[PDB]
Amino acid sequence: LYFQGADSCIQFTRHASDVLLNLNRLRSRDILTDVVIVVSREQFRAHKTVLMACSGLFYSIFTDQLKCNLSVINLDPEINPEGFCILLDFMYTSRLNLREGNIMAVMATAMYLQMEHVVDTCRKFIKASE
């Protein structure tokens, strides 16, 4: 469970993933969620801090003096709700449900959200599978 780090500190191998697991559990139970993200008809409840920790777009939105207190954010209605759902689940799990039938929507949504590492991954799967 723990090891001697390169610094003096003892480091816990599973800590970061357990935190994320607990954050996702709080999300499932709707505990301390503080924003609803709307993508066309679909609503997604989340924690602002998790969104800011994974997305350049959400970082910018929630550091804007006008927008930081909003409890509802409406995204571009042309964003595919399934693409967003996949990326949100990714944020809270590290797992990206990338499939032939969603990859383009996922990539487009990741670009919009400024998750450049996921965009780059989608490009690489598109190229390597061509």
């Binding site: 709307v38 509802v72 409406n74």
Partner: peptide
């Protein structure tokens, strides 16, 4: 925004 609000939610209905």
């Amino acid at each position: 925004w609000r939610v209905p």
